[PDB]
Amino acid sequence: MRIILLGAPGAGKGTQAQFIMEKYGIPQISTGDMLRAAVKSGSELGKQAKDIMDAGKLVTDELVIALVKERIAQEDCRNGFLLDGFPRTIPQADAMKEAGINVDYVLEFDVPDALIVDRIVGRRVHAPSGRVYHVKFNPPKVEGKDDVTGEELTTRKDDQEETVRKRLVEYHQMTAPLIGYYSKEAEAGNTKYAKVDGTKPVAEVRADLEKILG
Numbered sequence: 001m002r003i004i005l006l007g008a009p010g011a012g013k014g015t016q017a018q019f020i021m022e023k024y025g026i027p028q029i030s031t032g033d034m035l036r037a038a039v040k041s042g043s044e045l046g047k048q049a050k051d052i053m054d055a056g057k058l059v060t061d062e063l064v065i066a067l068v069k070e071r072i073a074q075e076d077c078r079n080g081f082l083l084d085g086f087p088r089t090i091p092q093a094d095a096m097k098e099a100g101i102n103v104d105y106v107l108e109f110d111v112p113d114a115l116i117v118d119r120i121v122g123r124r125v126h127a128p129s130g131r132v133y134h135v136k137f138n139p140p141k142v143e144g145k146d147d148v149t150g151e152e153l154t155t156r157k158d159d160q161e162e163t164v165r166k167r168l169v170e171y172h173q174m175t176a177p178l179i180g181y182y183s184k185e186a187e188a189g190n191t192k193y194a195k196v197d198g199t200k201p202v203a204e205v206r207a208d209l210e211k212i213l214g
């Protein structure tokens with residue numbers, strides 16, 4: 001099973017990724033998680049993203065494409081994977097097709113622009129695992145702590161109001177066109193496309209995705 005999650009920043013993609021991963025027993029390929037990890041570890045492949053992410057801009061297609069190629073070549077992706085934040089531009093989507101990476105489902109998470117800053121100001125993360133929380137809308141079971149490891153949650157450095165605004169501009173400029181791109185792929189019978197209302201509570205979005213996936 002191969003799935004792409006599409007949506008504006010803060011739409012809920014990473015939150016629902018956890019539930020899809022357990023359903024199909026497939027790993028999550030999160031380019032945001034991988035770029036942040038490369039910066040933290042100083043890995044030659046990806047540390048370049050530090051200044052770009054801080055400015056709210058997109059990392060070069062060339063750099064992310066190489067990160068994903070390396071990741072999906074490993075044994076745990078042999079029987080499927082979940083793409084979460086990739087592709088983010090048309091050239092990234094074209095690179096997947098040129099490389100013969102078809103997918104079974106493309107799932108669009110729709111959230112109005114006006115809700116996005118509130119979602120990100122309350123976002124707290126557990127960087128080692130990628131788990132995501134929200135202090136109001138989806139809080140940890142213990143305040144400030146990861147549910148699984150008990151480690152103190154952090155706030156992403158790019159989760160500031162002004163940076164999220166810039167991310168939203170970049171999304172509409174370069175990423176939103178992927179909705180039409182993959183809608184046409186579905187019209188041609190190359191994948192399945194579905195849109196969900198991301199303003200519903202987390203558990204209701206999860207149930208809506210269950211009905212689409214079966």
Ligand SMILES: Nc1ncnc2c1ncn2[C@@H]1O[C@H](COP(=O)(O)OP(=O)(O)OP(=O)(O)OP(=O)(O)OP(=O)(O)OC[C@H]2O[C@@H](n3cnc4c(N)ncnc43)[C@H](O)[C@@H]2O)[C@@H](O)[C@H]1O
Nearest residue numbers: 009010011012013014015031032059088119123133134137
């Ligand atoms: N492919 C690529 N090409 C180029 N550059 C790339 C790239 N990939 C990454 N980058 C770089 O990395 C930077 C950051 O990218 P990225 O890591 O993708 O961050 P982002 O743009 O801010 O959006 P996310 O995908 O992290 O949010 P989400 O849709 O998963 O929602 P979430 O579950 O967290 O939920 C949001 C919040 O709301 C809460 N919430 C979730 N669901 C609900 C709900 N249903 N109701 C209420 N609250 C909810 C959550 O708890 C959370 O707190 C980019 O600017 C770029 O520089």
